[PDB]
Design a protein around this ligand. Sequence first.
Ligand SMILES: C[S@@+](CC[C@H](N)C(=O)[O-])C[C@H]1O[C@@H](n2cnc3c(N)ncnc32)[C@H](O)[C@@H]1O
Ligand SMILES: C[S@@+](CC[C@H](N)C(=O)[O-])C[C@H]1O[C@@H](n2cnc3c(N)ncnc32)[C@H](O)[C@@H]1O
Ligand SMILES: [Zn+2]
Ligand SMILES: [Zn+2]
Lengths: 185, 184
Amino acid sequence: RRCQRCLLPEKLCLCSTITPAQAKSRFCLLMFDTEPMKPSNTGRLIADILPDTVAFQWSRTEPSQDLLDLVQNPYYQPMVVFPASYADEQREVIFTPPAGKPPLFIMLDGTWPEARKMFRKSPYLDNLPVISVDLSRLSAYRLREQYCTAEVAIALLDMAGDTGAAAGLGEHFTRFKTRYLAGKT
Amino acid sequence: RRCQRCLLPEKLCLCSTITPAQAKSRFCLLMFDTPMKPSNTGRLIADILPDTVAFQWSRTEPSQDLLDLVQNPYYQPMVVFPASYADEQREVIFTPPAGKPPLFIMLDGTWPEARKMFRKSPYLDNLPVISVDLSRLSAYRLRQYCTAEVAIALLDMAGDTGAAAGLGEHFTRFKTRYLAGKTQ
Ligand SMILES: C[S@@+](CC[C@H](N)C(=O)[O-])C[C@H]1O[C@@H](n2cnc3c(N)ncnc32)[C@H](O)[C@@H]1O
Ligand SMILES: C[S@@+](CC[C@H](N)C(=O)[O-])C[C@H]1O[C@@H](n2cnc3c(N)ncnc32)[C@H](O)[C@@H]1O
Ligand SMILES: [Zn+2]
Ligand SMILES: [Zn+2]
């Protein structure tokens, strides 16, 4: 009764509406559980609009070597997307994607206690900059300026100059949330 | 808090999504009254087919513009109502005839309102009643049926598949946002 690709009740299936976009930015979803994707999980909306998004199962002791190879690939400028109130005094915090190299935005995908734990117990992320997100930019896409993973990504895409992809994901996100609420009725 | 044109909350306003279509068929909305409730679906027809006409129904004095339209021999006018209500002598058809463009007269009200309109309208009595083949909704992945759903099936019955599909997609979009607005 639910479509397996978009996870909505089959009558509200939005798969035919999906139009991918292009962006200089790249996302990496670091997932706490990778359990059978819950419909309310907005992180997966990002990969619908930006199919080059990567996702990794998080692991406290044995991090995947694909993940290590990505976050260490000097082609990207990687950053950890998490609220700056969590970072320690010595941690570099930035407020803009830096200039020059394409950003790799590392999103901590889980509940808040799970994402906090991921933030504190992942040594391969510890020397990366934290990007504090400018959520006021959601207004330019007519979204309410915590915030879910797809809303942060929209702000990040806008912060990087990727306005086509930001608008694309905003429309996709709104479309999902509307149909999700409808199928709840 | 509600958009005045599409009647949904401003956050869910669909007005920018509306793409009008063209059709050989034409609709005439007969309304027991005209503020409108958001749940009324007859207004959706006009969004997709902007040549739709609507008239406020009256028992005593029908407006002359409505009398002029329904007697205009350019059209083949039809009263859209379930055939189980028609008189033994009432011409009932199951297909829009061919040749002259159809003019589909929809009785837009509640079922008690639509029935009184059907029975107490002398200017509609010589017109044929078209019984609607609702199974055609399957071709548009749809499905008492509401006004806009009956209009989709009539459009498909007439060969107006582009506008049938346009109205189906507009109808689903409104119904989804309407439901989402009831939640949250
Ligand atoms: C805790 S998860 C919540 C997941 C949500 N249930 C969903 O739809 O996927 C939200 C993640 O988005 C990012 N995020 C949320 N709010 C943020 C903020 N204010 N500043 C920086 N990143 C934020 C962080 O990566 C955070 O871990
Ligand atoms: C009773 S109104 C429903 C009003 C509803 N609140 C709305 O706005 O959609 C439905 C109208 O569509 C047409 N209709 C509905 N079901 C029909 C059927 N089975 N056969 C022929 N016409 C039908 C008739 O004109 C009827 O008056
Ligand atoms: Zn789907
Ligand atoms: Zn509107």
